Design an enzyme around this catalytic site. Structure first.
Site, PDB file in Angstrom:
ATOM      1  N   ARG A  63      -8.615  -7.423  -7.825  1.00  0.00           N
ATOM      2  CA  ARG A  63      -9.563  -8.530  -7.893  1.00  0.00           C
ATOM      3  C   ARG A  63     -10.949  -8.001  -8.226  1.00  0.00           C
ATOM      4  O   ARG A  63     -11.147  -6.791  -8.344  1.00  0.00           O
ATOM      5  CB  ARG A  63      -9.633  -9.209  -6.530  1.00  0.00           C
ATOM      6  CG  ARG A  63     -10.014  -8.233  -5.414  1.00  0.00           C
ATOM      7  CD  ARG A  63     -10.396  -8.940  -4.120  1.00  0.00           C
ATOM      8  NE  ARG A  63     -10.496  -8.020  -2.988  1.00  0.00           N
ATOM      9  CZ  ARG A  63     -11.543  -7.243  -2.714  1.00  0.00           C
ATOM     10  NH1 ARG A  63     -12.622  -7.254  -3.486  1.00  0.00           N
ATOM     11  NH2 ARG A  63     -11.503  -6.442  -1.657  1.00  0.00           N
TER      12      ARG A  63
ATOM     13  N   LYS B 271       0.742  -1.254   0.000  1.00  0.00           N
ATOM     14  CA  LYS B 271       0.000   0.000   0.000  1.00  0.00           C
ATOM     15  C   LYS B 271       0.775   1.309   0.000  1.00  0.00           C
ATOM     16  O   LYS B 271       0.385   2.257  -0.684  1.00  0.00           O
ATOM     17  CB  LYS B 271      -0.987  -0.004   1.165  1.00  0.00           C
ATOM     18  CG  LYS B 271      -1.830  -1.267   1.215  1.00  0.00           C
ATOM     19  CD  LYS B 271      -2.437  -1.568  -0.153  1.00  0.00           C
ATOM     20  CE  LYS B 271      -3.229  -2.875  -0.133  1.00  0.00           C
ATOM     21  NZ  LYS B 271      -3.908  -3.139  -1.437  1.00  0.00           N
TER      22      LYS B 271
ATOM     23  N   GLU C  71      -0.015  16.201   6.780  1.00  0.00           N
ATOM     24  CA  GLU C  71      -0.820  15.695   5.672  1.00  0.00           C
ATOM     25  C   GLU C  71      -2.074  16.545   5.537  1.00  0.00           C
ATOM     26  O   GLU C  71      -2.570  17.077   6.517  1.00  0.00           O
ATOM     27  CB  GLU C  71      -1.221  14.236   5.949  1.00  0.00           C
ATOM     28  CG  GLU C  71      -2.194  13.625   4.947  1.00  0.00           C
ATOM     29  CD  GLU C  71      -2.982  12.450   5.536  1.00  0.00           C
ATOM     30  OE1 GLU C  71      -2.349  11.525   6.099  1.00  0.00           O
ATOM     31  OE2 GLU C  71      -4.235  12.459   5.436  1.00  0.00           O
TER      32      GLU C  71
END
Lengths: 451, 451
Positions: free
Chosen positions: B291, B115, B199
């Site tokens: 997926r 990730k 952030e």
């Protein structure tokens, strides 16, 4: 005016109507007989009343139903199909009582209820009908001349006297001459007239029907046709939309003829004009059902138009905001009737209770039903358990989707038409798109299955 | 090469995959644990084998599954979602054994499984990510300058030392200064570095995700986005497609960014790139599921493209015959997860058996399930009973269709999310199309219901 809808029906169609109403935010009222106190529509409705003195009287007693509607403030009635759906009298009574009958005008229902007379009305409206003699044949010479212009084969039949009443197929002039003489011979011996009629013989016909929809403001459109040729005892088993025999130009040609004729008789709301098609794709009008059609879902799948919801909006006085040019036909849809009956013993009904029950689902799959474990098939109403409809971009994909759905549909406790349906989907001609109203008779092989 | 497919999964997804295969005419192989010997997929498959020494080992034992496939001549494996779906190792083992893994390349699955690292790969591929500090902050001055260009509010957090690790929201420069000093103060007392990171704070975010689909020949397209903001414990409950915040131009803008990035990493077959959207509709990449997605049906409804079937065709080496320009978005689709759980007791699972069970059906209604009377919710797998999906031309019609379907969905023997779902469909803000990932927290009123 529609503020509360009383559904004068039952089974899967009552569920279909109730869902449309719920989506519109319209409260509903259900009726039922004690023998179906646990039926699906009874549970789904906002109000539900057990009425009637017998299973059929529950849905056929015109005055009791009107009175109940008035009693609970239901200003509209949806008859679904069958029962009082095409009862011009009931429709008239509703109007007089101030109740909105969700269907065409009672006069229109009356007119169309007279099959021979309606065929004359449609004919004069420009709708093609099967050609034949203009009443009794005057002579053999006239019969021979008439046959030449309508084209062989033709049918000869006596309608009076004590002579043979069986229809006689004439495939050429010689057969016509011989059949005419034999027929008039039988009439003379019975001291009377034969009143012989001649008609064009439409052999190995397909059942092609057009979906009609119009508002009470003059806008009448058609939603294409449906091929319901696959029947048994004239009972529909599989229906498709659109048909594979009409091209887009012919689809519109007959479609416009349909809507033109519909407008001419003042028809509004949902309706179906049934025709028979010959091997070349020519249609001949037979009759018109002035109500929602059992197999309406396939047309909905290929046009994307909700017919039942529109029935209600139209009855409410709303304008049909769809122009004929907006009606598109995308892909193909197939509908198979899942009935509790044994196709091997000539479709005798299995009046029992469903034990295991699994409904298939997925992309392109739609199910119309009121069943579940415990569902019971009484001997009072139809044997329908569910209506399975599949949609796909092409004919072969639709066929394979249907077979795959059918193969995953588990139902025990009763015999059903599923094994039969599966074989049809696997059958060479059906897959190739080749079939007529005599398909089953021509394919006894589809009835062969493990059991 | 795909001639026989072994489904390395269970529940509703195994049924979904099996149906796609049946439609393609591909024989299937199912696996299962003894505790689900009567599961739906087991019955629907052509072959079915009970394997494993425990409920989870059945679907997670890489070598046993590969061996079985080899044993019965299954040259392809569909992992569905969860379990071994995103196991790069399993995918690698399949390839080495000559088995076609129905999914992206194992290297791609590996890359995306990291990730933090994948976020860097996507960033460099031109995919927008949440802006923030390039590693630890050098000073307060740098933090103040960084905050101005990324825009307030911002987040400050320590990632080292024994100082407080809680995230600190800074809504203006004064708060930033105070939070920075308090944080560095706590770090000094612990004799170490705080390794403070800054952030951008994306408040009241929406979860917006793009559907990706590409063949093994370079054609990669996107099937629009899905808004899955309505969750609980980060567990999805309701999903829609497309979203209501993106306009057609922005839909394509982000869509092309998605497919460009996908092509850059050599991605093929089905995939989903998850983003978070701010109040203005700006997206920031979070991660990518390599997926099939649980909620794939809503995208299928609005684009008319069968994703699972394409997964198989693509794995077979077939070319994706759909150009991006052919991808249209028609109407809206909503999907609600019908789970055996109690939303009032914070969604605790009802590990019991379903008694009454009636599945709704009709125009615009699709059901994905493996349930029926007797269906059992064991404590080993998810509590999902079914996935109800409704489609309609407009947002409000889709909402009303869903509520009507939910109100007719009977399920007894276990508590479900149906009452909760019904309230959401009735809730003022949801109806207006106003909702974020904190919708449930902001509407405790939807949990109030007869029971």
């Amino acid at each position: 005016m529609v503020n509360k809808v009383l559904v004068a029906n039952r089974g899967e169609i009552a569920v279909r109507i109730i869902r449309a109403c719920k989506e519109l935010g319209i409260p509903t009222v259900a009726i039922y007989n004690e023998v179906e106190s646990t039926a699906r529509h009874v549970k789904l409705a906002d109000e539900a009343y057990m009425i009637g003195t017998d299973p059929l009287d529950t849905y056929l007693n015109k005055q009791r139903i009107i009175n109940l509607a008035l009693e609970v403030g239901a200003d509209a009635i949806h008859p679904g199909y069958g029962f009082l759906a095409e009862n011009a009298e009931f429709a008239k009574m509703c109007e007089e009582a101030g109740i909105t009958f969700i269907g065409p005008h009672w006069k229109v229902i009356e007119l169309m209820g007279d099959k021979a007379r309606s065929k004359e009305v449609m004919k004069k409206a420009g709708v093609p009908v099967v050609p034949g003699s203009d009443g009794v044949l005057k002579s053999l010479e006239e019969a021979k001349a008439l046959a030449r212009e309508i084209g062989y084969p033709v049918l000869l039949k006596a309608t009076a006297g004590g002579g043979g009443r069986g229809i006689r197929i004439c495939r050429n002039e010689e057969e016509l001459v011989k059949n005419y003489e034999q027929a008039s011979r039988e009439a003379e011996k019975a001291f009377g007239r034969g009143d012989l009629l001649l008609e064009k013989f439409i052999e190995n016909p397909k059942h092609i029907e057009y979906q009609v929809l119009g508002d009470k403001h003059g806008n009448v459109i058609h939603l294409g046709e449906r091929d319901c040729s696959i029947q048994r005892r004239n009972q529909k088993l599989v229906e498709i939309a659109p048909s594979l025999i009409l091209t887009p130009e012919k689809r519109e040609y007959y479609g416009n003829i349909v809507t033109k004729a519909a407008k001419e008789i003042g028809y509004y709301n949902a309706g179906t004009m049934e025709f028979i098609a010959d091997q070349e794709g020519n249609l001949y009008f037979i009759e018109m059902n002035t109500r929602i059609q059992v197999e309406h879902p396939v047309s909905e799948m290929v046009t994307g138009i909700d017919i039942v919801k529109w029935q209600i909006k139209i009855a409410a006085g709303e304008p049909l905001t769809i122009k004929q040019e907006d009606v598109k036909f995308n892909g193909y849809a197939i509908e198979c009737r899942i009935n509790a009956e044994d196709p091997k013993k000539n479709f005798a009904p299995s009046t029992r209770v469903i034990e295991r029950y699994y409904v298939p689902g997925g992309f392109g799959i739609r199910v119309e039903h009121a069943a579940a474990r415990g569902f019971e098939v009484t001997p009072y109403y139809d044997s329908m358990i569910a209506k399975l409809i599949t949609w796909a971009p092409t004919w072969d994909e639709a066929v394979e989707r249907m077979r795959a759905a059918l193969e995953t549909y588990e139902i025990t406790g009763v015999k059903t038409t599923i094994p039969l349906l599966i074989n049809i989907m696997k059958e060479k001609d059906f897959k190739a798109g080749k079939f007529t109203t005599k398909y089953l008779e021509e394919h006894p092989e589809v009835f062969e299955y493990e059991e």
